[PDB]
Amino acid sequence: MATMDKVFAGYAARQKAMEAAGNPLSEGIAWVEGEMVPLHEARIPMLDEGFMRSDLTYDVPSVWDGRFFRLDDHLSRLEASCAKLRLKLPLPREEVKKILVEMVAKSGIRDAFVEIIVTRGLKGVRGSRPEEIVNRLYMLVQPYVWVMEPEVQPVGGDAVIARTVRRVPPGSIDPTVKNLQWGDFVRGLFEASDRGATYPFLTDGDANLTEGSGFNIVLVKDGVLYTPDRGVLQGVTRKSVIDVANAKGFEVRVEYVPVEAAYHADEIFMCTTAGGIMPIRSLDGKPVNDGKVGPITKAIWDGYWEMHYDPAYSFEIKY
Amino acid sequence: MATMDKVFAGYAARQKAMEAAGNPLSEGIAWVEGEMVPLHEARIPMLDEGFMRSDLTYDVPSVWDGRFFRLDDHLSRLEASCAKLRLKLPLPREEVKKILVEMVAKSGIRDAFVEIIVTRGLKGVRGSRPEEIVNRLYMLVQPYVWVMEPEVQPVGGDAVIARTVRRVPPGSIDPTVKNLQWGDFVRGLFEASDRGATYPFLTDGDANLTEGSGFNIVLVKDGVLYTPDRGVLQGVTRKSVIDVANAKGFEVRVEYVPVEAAYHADEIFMCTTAGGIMPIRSLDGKPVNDGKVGPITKAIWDGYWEMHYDPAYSFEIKY
Numbered sequence: 138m139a140t141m142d143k144v145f146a147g148y149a150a151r152q153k154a155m156e157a158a159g160n161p162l163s164e165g166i167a168w169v170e171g172e173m174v175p176l177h178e179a180r181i182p183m184l185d186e187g188f189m190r191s192d193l194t195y196d197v198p199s200v201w202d203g204r205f206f207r208l209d210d211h212l213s214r215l216e217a218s219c220a221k222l223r224l225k226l227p228l229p230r231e232e233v234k235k236i237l238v239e240m241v242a243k244s245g246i247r248d249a250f251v252e253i254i255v256t257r258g259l260k261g262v263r264g265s266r267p268e269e270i271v272n273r274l275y276m277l278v279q280p281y282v283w284v285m286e287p288e289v290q291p292v293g294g295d296a297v298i299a300r301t302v303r304r305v306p307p308g309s310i311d312p313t314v315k316n317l318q319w320g321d322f323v324r325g326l327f328e329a330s331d332r333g334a335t336y337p338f339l340t341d342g343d344a345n346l347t348e349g350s351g352f353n354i355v356l357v358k359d360g361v362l363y364t365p366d367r368g369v370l371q372g373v374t375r376k377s378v379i380d381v382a383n384a385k386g387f388e389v390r391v392e393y394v395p396v397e398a399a400y401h402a403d404e405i406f407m408c409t410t411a412g413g414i415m416p417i418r419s420l421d422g423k424p425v426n427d428g429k430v431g432p433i434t435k436a437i438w439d440g441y442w443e444m445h446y447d448p449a450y451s452f453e454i455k456y
Numbered sequence: 457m458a459t460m461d462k463v464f465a466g467y468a469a470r471q472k473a474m475e476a477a478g479n480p481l482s483e484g485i486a487w488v489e490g491e492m493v494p495l496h497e498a499r500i501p502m503l504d505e506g507f508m509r510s511d512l513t514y515d516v517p518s519v520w521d522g523r524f525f526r527l528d529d530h531l532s533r534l535e536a537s538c539a540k541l542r543l544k545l546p547l548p549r550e551e552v553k554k555i556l557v558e559m560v561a562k563s564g565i566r567d568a569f570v571e572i573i574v575t576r577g578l579k580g581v582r583g584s585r586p587e588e589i590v591n592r593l594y595m596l597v598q599p600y601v602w603v604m605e606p607e608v609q610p611v612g613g614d615a616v617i618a619r620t621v622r623r624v625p626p627g628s629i630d631p632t633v634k635n636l637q638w639g640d641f642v643r644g645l646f647e648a649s650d651r652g653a654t655y656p657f658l659t660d661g662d663a664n665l666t667e668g669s670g671f672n673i674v675l676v677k678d679g680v681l682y683t684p685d686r687g688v689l690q691g692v693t694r695k696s697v698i699d700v701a702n703a704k705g706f707e708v709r710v711e712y713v714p715v716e717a718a719y720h721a722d723e724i725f726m727c728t729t730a731g732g733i734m735p736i737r738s739l740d741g742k743p744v745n746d747g748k749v750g751p752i753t754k755a756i757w758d759g760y761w762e763m764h765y766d767p768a769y770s771f772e773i774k775y
């Protein structure tokens with residue numbers, strides 16, 4: 138369990154140093170209407186009908202150890218999300234990239250959660266002519282967010298297959314469009330908490346796994362990785378999982394994963410930008426296999442963080 | 457078609473008078489953090505995790521001809537919406553009532569769209585302890601909004617049964633909780649527009665009608681009114697429709713309404729606070745019956761606006 142120490146110890150050191158620098162901007166910076174403002178003072182107009190009706194999409198790249206991770210993948214997914222929503226990125230993609238690097242640089246944050254939001258704008262879809270709709274852009278940079286805290290990743294967390302809620306189906310809301318309409322996920326969070334666990338796994342209502350509240354799901358069984366194809370966000374972390382798995386000779390099947398498979402899996406882990414590779418030790422109050430972080434999961438964990446220093450997948454920021 | 461003239465002519469006169477008064481506050485007033493501010497300057501903090509994840513509920517009473525319509529019904533539905541979301545109205549209900557009356561009074565608006573929003577607050581559900589969650593309140597007053605403009609209600613609008621999208625199911629998001637997660641409704645709006653119509657009727661994906669983008673649906677067939685029970689908001693307008701129908705001896709069945717019934721209906725109309733009683737002359741590009749506003753619909757229209765002057769359902773505002 139060495140590489141986790143090196144990763145987490147490095148993170149700790151950089152957090153210790155950022156508090157020492159006392160920079161007020163290291164609490165976060167936002168981009169709103171062409172202007173960079175401190176995070177705790179960034180505000181959205183109530184007249185942004187888009188934002189009001191959550192008629193928007195968003196995406197969250199990260200910065201780790203001063204390096205932006207797969208930014209172009211996130212920008213490309215955001216553009217595809219916009220197109221599916223009949224939205225348009227209000228600024229050229231390369232300018233968004235420049236602003237984001239500047240914001241991270243000016244903030245001094247070495248490990249950052251970065252968020253880009255495109256909304257319909259001030260005039261909503263209902264009863265407005267196409268000429269009158271002007272999409273709006275919001276961006277943000279802030280310290281890295283953990284869906285699983287570093288102290289838990291060596292042991293793994295507690296999940297449940299949710300039984301009081303199921304995933305919004307693609308015929309209502311396209312799950313490949315990263316969105317903030319979290320009604321089902323929030324029910325899943327409360328259900329997990331009510332049942333004495335932390336992470337909800339949502340079904341599709343048809344006996345298959347989909348995803349959870351802010352993460353994709355992966356099963357390991359007899360040396361093969363399984364993760365749902367339909368009904369889920371096509372995560373960039375999931376993508377990196379496939380890259381590491383291929384590089385290490387593990388097969389990954391992106392396909393229909395029945396709920397039943399979760400109860401027989403050798404290993405389970407979640408993956409997401411806000412936290413990385415997140416092992417699950419128990420499901421529905423029962424141990425996953427031996428209740429430990431599995432070997433294939435640790436290989437995926439190691440490779441995922443290793444690739445944060447591959448220039449094919451990252452670039453360094455000048456602060 | 458007299459009573460529509462009296463209603464719309466009165467509305468016109470009051471709009472003519474509000475423009476004459478030139479009051480800048482007659483464009484709207486908002487309540488944000490204890491302070492009343494002009495609408496075009498009201499802003500929401502990006503750190504409102506609730507609002508960000510649309511982890512909120514809301515409700516929209518109206519003011520017509522200087523009288524608040526069924527405010528207590530809306531406040532009661534909002535409280536029930538909060539309870540289902542494990543939210544709490546941050547101020548006592550009677551104080552919210554007082555603020556809203558004051559806001560309408562100070563604004564001078566005689567015909568108003570009024571909106572109350574309760575969000576999870578600055579600390580979201582995920583990874584926060586129950587002690588750290590403080591729900592936040594937002595309110596707004598602005599000129600009356602029409603989902604169907606007065607000029608169209610005498611003739612009726614053009615609807616379609618949506619075929620590219622279906623209603624979010626209650627097992628994902630409780631439709632009796634008025635909410636702003638409009639992903640499916642926005643797809644329905646674009647589909648309607650693509651097909652040359654205006655109003656989408658969403659199915660439940662199981663061959664029954666539910667509701668539309670901001671309105672309940674009612675069918676009239678052989679002297680009986682039909683409106684879906686499950687999968688929809690229990691509208692206050694729908695409630696008033698039942699009151700008028702009962703008073704006039706018409707039966708209303710709140711039950712499963714198959715999609716097939718829409719294609720054989722004698723009359724169809726939508727109902728919502730933002731516009732009232734809204735007849736539909738065509739469905740899927742075909743006439744509804746004779747393509748005219750039907751008689752039972754006009755009786756419902758007349759009674760609905762009549763009851764805006766019944767003290768059992770309204771009170772007058774002192775401006």
Ligand SMILES: *Cc1c(COP(=O)(O)O)cnc(C)c1O
Nearest residue numbers: 351352353370372373374409410
């Ligand atoms: C963000 C998120 C994921 C993970 O996607 P990444 O691109 O790896 O961050 C998966 N599912 C949902 C619902 C998410 O919000």
Ligand SMILES: *Cc1c(COP(=O)(O)O)cnc(C)c1O
Nearest residue numbers: 670671672689691692693728729
């Ligand atoms: C607001 C709305 C209605 C109508 O409800 P009222 O209380 O009559 O205003 C119906 N369905 C949806 C989805 C709505 O947003």
Ligand code: NA
Nearest residue numbers: 195215218315
């Ligand atoms: Na996106």
Ligand code: NA
Nearest residue numbers: 353364365369
């Ligand atoms: Na998946």
Ligand code: NA
Nearest residue numbers: 514534537634
């Ligand atoms: Na409500």
Ligand code: NA
Nearest residue numbers: 672683684688
């Ligand atoms: Na109904």
